[PDB]
Amino acid sequence: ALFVHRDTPENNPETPFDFTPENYKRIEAIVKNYPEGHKAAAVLPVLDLAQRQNGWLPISAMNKVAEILQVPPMRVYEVATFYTMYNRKPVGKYHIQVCTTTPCMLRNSDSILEAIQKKLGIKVGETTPDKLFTLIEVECLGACVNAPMVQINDNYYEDLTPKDIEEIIDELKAGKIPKPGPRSGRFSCEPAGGLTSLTEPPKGPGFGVQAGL
Amino acid sequence: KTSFGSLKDEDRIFTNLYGRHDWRLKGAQSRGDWYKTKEILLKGPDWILGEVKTSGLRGRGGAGFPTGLKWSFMNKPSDGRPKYLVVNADEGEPGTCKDREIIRHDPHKLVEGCLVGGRAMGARAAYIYIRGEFYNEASNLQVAIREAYEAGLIGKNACGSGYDFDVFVVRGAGAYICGEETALIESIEGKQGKPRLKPPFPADVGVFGCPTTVANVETVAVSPTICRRGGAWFASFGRERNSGTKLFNISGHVNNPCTVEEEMSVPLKELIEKHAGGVTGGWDNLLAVIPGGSSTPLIPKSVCETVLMDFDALIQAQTGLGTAAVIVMDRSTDIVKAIARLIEFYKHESCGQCTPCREGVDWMNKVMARFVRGDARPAEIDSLWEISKQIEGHTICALGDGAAWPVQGLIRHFRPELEERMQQFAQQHQ
Amino acid sequence: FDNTTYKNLQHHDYSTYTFLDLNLDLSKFRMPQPSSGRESPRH
Amino acid sequence: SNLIEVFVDGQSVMVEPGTTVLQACEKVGMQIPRFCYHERLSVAGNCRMCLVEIEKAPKVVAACAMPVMKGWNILTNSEKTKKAREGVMEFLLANHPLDCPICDQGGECDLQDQSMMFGSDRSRFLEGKRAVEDKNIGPLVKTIMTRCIQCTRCIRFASEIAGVDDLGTTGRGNDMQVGTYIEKMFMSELSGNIIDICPVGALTSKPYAFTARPWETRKTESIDVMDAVGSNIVVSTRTGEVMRILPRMHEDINEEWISDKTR
Numbered sequence: 030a031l032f033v034h035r036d037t038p039e040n041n042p043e044t045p046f047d048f049t050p051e052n053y054k055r056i057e058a059i060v061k062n063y064p065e066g067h068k069a070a071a072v073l074p075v076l077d078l079a080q081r082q083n084g085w086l087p088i089s090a091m092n093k094v095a096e097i098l099q100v101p102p103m104r105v106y107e108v109a110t111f112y113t114m115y116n117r118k119p120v121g122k123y124h125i126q127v128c129t130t131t132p133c134m135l136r137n138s139d140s141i142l143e144a145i146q147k148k149l150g151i152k153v154g155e156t157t158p159d160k161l162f163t164l165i166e167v168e169c170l171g172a173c174v175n176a177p178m179v180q181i182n183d184n185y186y187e188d189l190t191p192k193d194i195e196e197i198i199d200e201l202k203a204g205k206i207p208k209p210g211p212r213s214g215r216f217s218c219e220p221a222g223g224l225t226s227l228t229e230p231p232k233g234p235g236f237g238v239q240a241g242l
Numbered sequence: 243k244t245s246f247g248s249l250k251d252e253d254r255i256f257t258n259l260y261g262r263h264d265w266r267l268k269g270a271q272s273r274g275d276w277y278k279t280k281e282i283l284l285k286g287p288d289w290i291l292g293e294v295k296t297s298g299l300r301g302r303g304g305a306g307f308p309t310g311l312k313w314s315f316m317n318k319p320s321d322g323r324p325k326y327l328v329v330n331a332d333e334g335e336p337g338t339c340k341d342r343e344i345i346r347h348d349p350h351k352l353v354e355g356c357l358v359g360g361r362a363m364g365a366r367a368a369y370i371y372i373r374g375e376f377y378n379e380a381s382n383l384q385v386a387i388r389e390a391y392e393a394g395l396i397g398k399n400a401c402g403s404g405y406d407f408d409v410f411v412v413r414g415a416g417a418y419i420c421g422e423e424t425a426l427i428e429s430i431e432g433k434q435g436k437p438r439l440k441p442p443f444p445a446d447v448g449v450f451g452c453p454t455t456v457a458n459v460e461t462v463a464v465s466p467t468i469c470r471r472g473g474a475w476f477a478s479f480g481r482e483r484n485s486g487t488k489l490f491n492i493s494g495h496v497n498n499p500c501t502v503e504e505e506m507s508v509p510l511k512e513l514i515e516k517h518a519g520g521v522t523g524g525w526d527n528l529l530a531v532i533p534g535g536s537s538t539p540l541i542p543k544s545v546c547e548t549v550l551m552d553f554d555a556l557i558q559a560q561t562g563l564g565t566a567a568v569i570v571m572d573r574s575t576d577i578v579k580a581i582a583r584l585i586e587f588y589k590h591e592s593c594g595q596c597t598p599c600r601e602g603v604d605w606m607n608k609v610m611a612r613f614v615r616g617d618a619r620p621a622e623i624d625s626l627w628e629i630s631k632q633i634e635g636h637t638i639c640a641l642g643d644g645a646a647w648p649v650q651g652l653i654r655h656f657r658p659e660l661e662e663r664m665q666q667f668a669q670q671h672q
Numbered sequence: 673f674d675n676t677t678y679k680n681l682q683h684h685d686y687s688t689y690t691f692l693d694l695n696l697d698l699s700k701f702r703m704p705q706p707s708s709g710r711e712s713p714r715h
Numbered sequence: 716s717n718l719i720e721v722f723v724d725g726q727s728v729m730v731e732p733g734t735t736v737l738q739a740c741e742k743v744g745m746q747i748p749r750f751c752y753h754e755r756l757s758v759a760g761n762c763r764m765c766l767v768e769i770e771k772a773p774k775v776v777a778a779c780a781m782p783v784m785k786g787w788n789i790l791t792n793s794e795k796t797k798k799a800r801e802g803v804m805e806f807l808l809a810n811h812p813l814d815c816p817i818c819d820q821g822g823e824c825d826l827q828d829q830s831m832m833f834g835s836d837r838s839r840f841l842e843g844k845r846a847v848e849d850k851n852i853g854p855l856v857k858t859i860m861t862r863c864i865q866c867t868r869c870i871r872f873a874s875e876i877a878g879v880d881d882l883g884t885t886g887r888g889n890d891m892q893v894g895t896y897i898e899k900m901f902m903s904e905l906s907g908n909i910i911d912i913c914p915v916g917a918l919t920s921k922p923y924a925f926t927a928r929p930w931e932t933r934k935t936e937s938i939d940v941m942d943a944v945g946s947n948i949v950v951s952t953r954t955g956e957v958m959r960i961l962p963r964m965h966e967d968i969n970e971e972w973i974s975d976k977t978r
C-alpha cells in the first residue's frame with residue numbers, strides 16, 4: 030500500500046524485463062496514435078501493455094517504458110502510482126475486484142465479499158498461498174444497475190448472489206473460464222421480468238428524417 | 243405540453259440499448275445509423291451547429307451546459323494547430339452506467355457522432371477516452387471502428403465527403419477524476435489525471451495544447467440523429483430549456499434495477515414505478531433518492547412525490563439532474579452510512595492536487611465515520627456544514643463540489659437522524 | 673424477427689491482447705499524424 | 716496604449732494584457748498571500764491561498780493564475796476573500812505537524828506568518844493527523860516530509876531551473892507524496908536552492924540544522940567568491956560566527972539563486 034519503492038531481490042533495477050518482439054510491434058501502433066513530438070502520451074497504454082505481458086510492474090518494467098518513450102523515469106513512476114489499475118507488487122492469477130460503493134452496497138455487496146473470503150480463506154487485500162487469487166475492494170465499476178458485481182481480470186460478473194460467486198470461483202479453480210455477465214437471468218441492463226421499452230421492431234433507414242436531407 | 247413521459251419506441255434514439263439486435267455495422271445500418279451521413283457533412287459545420295442549438299441539447303456528462311453554444315467555441319479560423327474532439331467515456335459517477343451500454347450495444351452511433359460532431363468543430367480526429375475497466379466495451383468499440391474504416395465511413399474521404407477524420411480509442415487506468423474534462427486531457431497526454439485551471443479553456447488550449455472539445459458519450463451519440471430528424475424534433479421532448487430524451491439508470495432499492503430511455507421532465511415517481519418495478523417494499527418504503535449520481539444531494543420521500551427529472555426542476559429541489567443516475571434508498575437503509583460510503587469514495591478518488599479537496603475531503607471522511615457511530619457532538623454538524631462550504635467553490639475542479647454536496651444533502655434533510663445517533667451513542671458510553 | 677436473445681456474445685472470447693491487436697490492425701488506415709516540429713518538449 | 720484598466724480595491728491601475736490578478740495587486744503595493752506561486756517558476760495554482768473576490772463575480776478566482784480582465788475590481792480585503800483565506804489555511808494546518816519548536820523554519824516560516832496574518836487563531840480539527848515517511852536525497856538537504864504542504868515548488872524548480880526531473884508526486888489524494896519514489900540523491904549544483912523555495916520546514920539545510928533561529932542572526936549583504944559570477948549573498952552571523960549563506964536577489968546576476976558551493 031506504499032508509494033515509495035525499496036529495492037528487493039525480486040524487484041529492483043536489475044530485475045529482468047523486456048518487451049517481446051510481438052509486443053514491440055504493438056508499441057509502434059500505440060505510439061503512432063499521437064502527434065509527432067508528443068510521444069509521452071503513450072506512457073499509459075505502453076505501461077499497461079508491460080503489465081499485461083508481465084502481470085505487474087516491477088521498477089525495471091517502469092524504467093523500460095521510460096527508456097523506450099524517452100521520458101524521465103520519475104514521470105513514469107508518477108503515472109504508475111497515480112492510477113489504481115497498475116499493480117506495483119505481484120498479484121494472483123485472478124485479481125478479484127469487488128465493488129463496494131453505495132449502489133452496490135445497497136444491494137448487499139457485503140454478502141459477496143463475505144462469501145469470497147469464506148470460500149478462499151483469505152482476507153481483503155490478501156493473496157492465496159497457491160497464488161491463484163487476489164481479493165480487493167474497489168469503487169464503482171460502472172455497472173450499478175447490475176449490482177452487486179465483481180470484476181475478475183478483464184471480465185465483469187454481475188447480479189451476484191453468494192451462490193453465484195462461489196460457482197464462479199470453483200470454475201476458476203477447475204480451469205474453466207466462466208462467461209461474464211449477469212447471473213440472475215437477464216442478459217444485460219434490461220429490467221428483470223420483461224422489457225418496458227424497445228419491444229417494438231426498430232425503424233429502418235430514413236425514418237423520421239427531416240426534409241432537405 | 244404539461245405532462246412528459248411515456249416516450250414511444252419510434253422516438254427512442256438508442257434502439258439497441260439492451261443488445262438484443264446486432265450491434266455491428268450491418269445491424270446499425272439497418273437501424274438507421276450511418277444514413278445520409280455524407281449529406282449532413284456537406285451541409286457544413288454552421289448547419290450542424292444550427293441543428294444542435296435548435297435541439298436545445300445540453301451536456302449529458304453531468305454539468306449540463308448547452309451543447310450547441312459549447313461546440314461553437316471551436317467554429318473559428320485555424321491558427322496552425324490541429325483541432326481535436328475528445329469523447330468522454332470515463333463514466334465514473336457511482337450509480338451511472340448509461341454510457342457503458344452505448345459503447346457496447348450502439349457503438350456505431352458513437353462513431354458517427356464523433357464524425358458529425360468532429361465536423362462541426364473542424365476537428366481532424368476524435369480521441370475516445372474509455373475507462374480502463376471497460377475492457378470488453380473498448381474492444382467492441384474498436385471492432386466497430388475497424389468496420390467503419392473498412393467501409394470508408396471514417397478516415398480518408400469520410401463517407402465520400404472529402405473530410406479526413408480519425409477515431410482513436412485510448413483507455414484509462416483506474417481513476418474517477420479522469421472523467422473531469424481537463425484531467426481527461428492530462429491523462430491522454432500521459433501525465434497524472436490532475437485537472438487544469440481555467441483559463442485557458444480547452445477550445446483554446448486543450449489536448450497536446452491544441453483547440454479541443456470534451457463531450458460526453460451520450461451527448462455525441464445523439465448528434466447524428468438530431469441532424470437527421472432535426473433540432474425541432476428533439477426540442478419537442480421535455481420542458482423548455484430541458485429538451486430531449488435521456489438515459490436513466492435506476493439502482494438501489496427497486497424491484498427491477500435497469501437502464502431505460504425516457505423523456506426529459508418525466509416525473510421521478512413515474513420513472514421508478516413504470517420502468518424500475520417500483521420501490522422495494524412499496525412506494526411508502528422509500529427513504530431518500532439520489533437523483534443524478536453520487537454528486538447530487540439526496541432528496542427525501544416527500545420531495546420525490548412530485549419532482550420532475552430535468553435540469554431546472556431538480557435545481558428547484560436543491561439537488562441536480564447530474565448524470566440521471568437514480569439511486570433509491572428504502573426505509574431499511576442506514577442513510578448516514580450510505581452517505582458516509584460516498585464520502586469515502588471521494589476520498590479515494592481525489593487527485594490530491596489542491597488543498598481544499600486533498601485535505602478537506604479526507605477531513606470530511608473522518609467526521610462522517612464518527613457520525614455513523616454517533617461518536618460525535620451535535621455542534622460538529624454545523625462544523626461539518628461549514629467545512630463543506632470551505633471546499634465548495636474553492637477547488638480547481640468540481641470533484642470538491644461533488645464531495646461537499648452529498649454531505650449538505652444529508653445535513654439538510656436528515657439532521658434529526660444524525661442527532662439521534664449521537665444521543666444514543668452517549669447513553670451507551672456514559 | 674427475434675427480440676428474445678442477447679446478440680453481444682462475441683466479447684466472451686476476447687483475450688488479453690484483443691484491444692491492442694485491433695489497434696495494430698487499424699494503424700494502416702490512419703491519416704498521417706501532425707507534428708509539433710520537434711522531437712519532444714525537451715528538445 | 717496596449718494597457719487595460721483594472722481596479723484594486725477601487726483604485727485604478729493600467730496593466731499589460733496577460734497580467735494576472737496577483738500582479739495587478741502588487742502594482743498598488745498589495746501582496747496577495749501565496750504558497751504554491753513563485754514568480755520565477757511556472758504557475759501551479761494548487762495551494763489556493765491566493766483566492767480573491769472579483770466584484771460582482773460569485774466565484775473567487777486564483778489570483779496567481781487568473782489573467783485580469785478590463786474593468787475588474789479586485790477586492791483583496793472583502794469578507795468573501797478573508798473567509799476564503801481562513802478556510803484554506805485551516806485545511807493547510809489540519810494535517811500539519813506540531814513541530815515549530817523543533818523545526819528549523821520556525822521564525823522565518825511562511826506558513827506561520829500567513830497563519831498569523833490571514834488565518835483563524837484556533838483549531839476545530841478533532842481527528843488524528845497524517846504522518847509521512849522521510850526521504851533521503853543527499854547530504855545537503857534534510858527532508859521532514861510530514862511538514863510538506865504539497866505546493867510542488869521543489870518539483871517545478873528541479874524540472875525548470877535545475878533541469879533535473881528527479882522530483883515528482885506519487886500516490887493520490889491525501890496520501891499524495893513529494894519525492895523521488897526510488898532511493899535517489901538530488902545532487903545538482905543548484906540543489907540547495909530547494910531549501911529556500913520550500914515555504915515550510917519540509918526541506919531544510921542539513922549543515923545548518925538546529926544551530927540558530929532567524930531573529931537572532933545579523934544579515935551582512937556581501938558577494939560570493941567561489942566563482943567569477945559574483946553572486947550576491949547574505950552572510951548570516953550570530954555572536955561573531957558565520958552561521959549560513961543565503962542568496963541575495965540580483966536580477967542581472969544570480970536572480971535569487973546560488974550554487975551549492977556558494978551556499
Ligand SMILES: Cc1cc2nc3c(=O)[nH]c(=O)nc-3n(C[C@H](O)[C@H](O)[C@H](O)COP(=O)(O)O)c2cc1C
Nearest residue numbers: 301302303330333334421422423457458461640641
Ligand atoms: C470528478 C468528475 C468526474 C467526471 N466524470 C465524468 C464522466 O465520467 N463522464 C462525463 O461525460 N463527464 C464527467 N465529468 C464532467 C466533465 O468534466 C465535463 O463536464 C463533461 O465531459 C462535458 O461533456 P458534456 O457537455 O457533453 O456533458 C466529470 C466531472 C468531474 C468533476
Ligand code: SF4
Nearest residue numbers: 593595596599637639
Ligand atoms: S478538487 Fe480534488 S480532484 Fe479536483 S483538482 Fe482539487 S484535489 Fe484534484
Ligand code: SF4
Nearest residue numbers: 814815818821824916
Ligand atoms: S513548517 Fe512552519 S508551521 Fe510547520 S512546523 Fe515548521 S515552523 Fe511550524
Ligand code: SF4
Nearest residue numbers: 863864866867869913
Ligand atoms: S517539499 Fe516544500 S517545496 Fe516541495 S512540495 Fe513540499 S512544501 Fe512544497
Ligand code: FES
Nearest residue numbers: 128133169170173
Ligand atoms: S456502485 Fe458498484 S458498479 Fe457502481
Ligand code: FES
Nearest residue numbers: 751762763765779
Ligand atoms: S498561490 Fe495561487 S493557488 Fe497557490
Ligand SMILES: [K+]
Nearest residue numbers: 910913915918
Ligand atoms: K525551507
